[PDB]
C-alpha cells in the first residue's frame with residue numbers, strides 16, 4: 001500500500017505539473033504571445049511606478065523593457081496610452097539603468113529628454129508616439145508587465 | 150526513505166499550489182482586473198437569470214453586482230450590452246436584495262424604473278449608459294460574473 | 299504518522315485537480331466559450347499550416363473547423379484576418395477531409411473555389427465575408443485553434 005500509493009502520487013503530481021504547464025501555454029497564446037517572442041500584458045490600470053514593479057513582481061514578471069525598436073512598438077501597441085518602462089536613473093541622477101540591471105543598450109528619447117524636469121523625474125514612460133519621456137515615479141501611468149520569450 | 154520522499158512530494162505540492170494561484174492572478178490581470186478591485190468577466194453569452202446564477206456559481210464567482218458608480222461603470226464596459234445584475238425583488242415586491250444577501254444600497258435606475266412591468270419583473274439588467282431596468286428573470290441577457298478583489 | 303500524511307497529500311492533490319479544472323473553466327469562459335459550444339482562440343500570429351497544426355495539437359485542440367454557419371462566423375470574428383481551417387485535401391486531391399477525420403460536409407466556399415490553383419492548393423483559409431478559399435499549405439495565415447464543447 002504505502003509505497004504503491006506514494007509512487008502513484010508522484011505520477012499524479014507530474015501529471016498535474018504537465019497540465020498546469022499546458023494551461024499556462026494556452027493562456028499565453030490567448031494573451032497574444034507570439035512564437036519565440038517575449039510578451040507584454042496589461043490590465044490597463046494606471047498607477048505609480050513602485051506599484052507597477054510590485055504588481056509585475058507578484059506575477060513573476062518584470063516592468064516592460066524594450067530592447068530594440070520592435071519590442072518598443074510591441075509595448076506601445078499593448079499599452080495604448082503612456083506606460084512605465086522598467087528603466088530609472090534612481091541610483092545615480094542622469095544615468096538610466098534597467099530595473100533588471102545594467103546600462104541602456106537601446107533608447108528612443110523624445111527630443112531634449114530625459115530632462116529631470118522640475119522637482120525631478122527618475123522614471124520613464126513610453127508615450128503615444130513610441131518615444132520616451134522621463135517623468136515622476138510618483139505619477140500614475142499604465143502598468144505593463146513582461147514575461148520571457 | 151519513505152518519510153523523505155513524502156516530505157519532498159509535499160514540497161512539490163506546495164510549489165504547484167503557488168504556481169496555480171500565480172496563474173489565476175496573471176489571468177485576472179490579463180482580463181483587466183484592477184488592483185484591489187473586484188474582477189468582472191463575461192463570455193458574452195445571453196441567457197435567463199437562473200442560468201447566469203448557475204454558471205457564475207460553477208466558476209466559484211457570483212452574478213455581477215455594482216456596489217457603487219465605479220463598479221457600475223466597470224460592469225458596463227465588460228458587458229457591452231444588457232446584462233443581469235445579482236439583484237432581485239423576489240421576496241417582497243419593490244425590495245431589491247443582492248443575491249448574496251443584504252438590501253440594495255447603490256442603485257442607478259432608468260427614468261420610470263423599476264416598473265415591475267407586465268406580468269411582473271423581479272430581475273435587474275444594466276443597460277444603456279449603465280442605467281438599470283427591471284426585467285423578467287426569464288428573459289435572456291448577458292452573463293457577467295464577479296470574483297473578489 | 300506516515301499514513302495520515304499520505305491521506306492529506308491525497309486530499310491536497312484532489313483539491314488541486316478541482317482548482318485547476320476551475321481555472322481552465324474560467325479561462326474558457328473569459329475566452330468567449332458559450333455553454334455547450336466549442337470555442338476558438340488565436341494569438342494573431344501568421345504561420346504555415348503545419349505550424350498551426352503543431353501549435354493547436356500541443357494545446358490539446360485542433361486547427362479551427364467550422365461545422366456550420368454559426369461556428370464559421372465565430373471563427374471569422376476571432377481571426378479578424380485570413381486563417382487556416384482544419385480542413386485539407388492533402389490525402390486525396392479533390393476530397394477535403396477534416397484534420398481530425400471524416401469527409402467535409404458543411405462548406406462555405408467562395409464562388410469558383412476550391413480550384414487547386416496552379417501547382418496545387420491543399421489547405422483552406424477562411425477569408426473575406428467568412429467565405430473559404432483553398433490555398434497552399436505553405437503560405438502563412440493566422441493560427442486559430444478550436445477547443446471542445
Ligand SMILES: CO[C@@H]1O[C@@H](C)[C@@H](O)[C@@H](O)[C@@H]1O
Pocket residue numbers: 113115117121133134135
Ligand atoms: C518641460 O518638461 C516636459 O514637460 C513636462 C510637462 C513633463 O512632461 C516633463 O517630463 C517633460 O520633460
Ligand SMILES: CO[C@@H]1O[C@@H](C)[C@@H](O)[C@@H](O)[C@@H]1O
Pocket residue numbers: 262264266270282283284
Ligand atoms: C414600458 O416598460 C419598459 O419597456 C418594456 C418593453 C420592458 O422592457 C420593461 O422592462 C420596461 O420598463
Ligand SMILES: CO[C@@H]1O[C@@H](C)[C@@H](O)[C@@H](O)[C@@H]1O
Pocket residue numbers: 411413415419431432433
Ligand atoms: C485564381 O485563383 C485564385 O486567386 C489566386 C491568387 C489564389 O488566391 C487562389 O487560391 C484563388 O483560387
Ligand SMILES: [Ca+2]
Pocket residue numbers: 089090093120121122
Ligand atoms: Ca533623481
Ligand SMILES: [Ca+2]
Pocket residue numbers: 089093094116120121122123134
Ligand atoms: Ca532623473
Ligand SMILES: [Ca+2]
Pocket residue numbers: 113114115116117121133134135
Ligand atoms: Ca521629462
Ligand SMILES: [Ca+2]
Pocket residue numbers: 238239242265269270271
Ligand atoms: Ca414580484
Ligand SMILES: [Ca+2]
Pocket residue numbers: 238242243265269270271272283
Ligand atoms: Ca418586481
Ligand SMILES: [Ca+2]
Pocket residue numbers: 262263264265266270282283284
Ligand atoms: Ca422594467
Ligand SMILES: [Ca+2]
Pocket residue numbers: 387388390391418419420
Ligand atoms: Ca494535391
Ligand SMILES: [Ca+2]
Pocket residue numbers: 413414415416
Ligand atoms: Ca486551374
Ligand SMILES: [Ca+2]
Pocket residue numbers: 387391392414418419420421432
Ligand atoms: Ca487540392
Ligand SMILES: [Ca+2]
Pocket residue numbers: 411412413414415419431432433
Ligand atoms: Ca483557391
Ligand SMILES: [Cl-]
Pocket residue numbers: 120121122123135136137138
Ligand atoms: Cl521621480
Ligand SMILES: [Cl-]
Pocket residue numbers: 269270271272284285286287
Ligand atoms: Cl421576474
Ligand SMILES: [Cl-]
Pocket residue numbers: 418419420421433434435436
Ligand atoms: Cl498545398
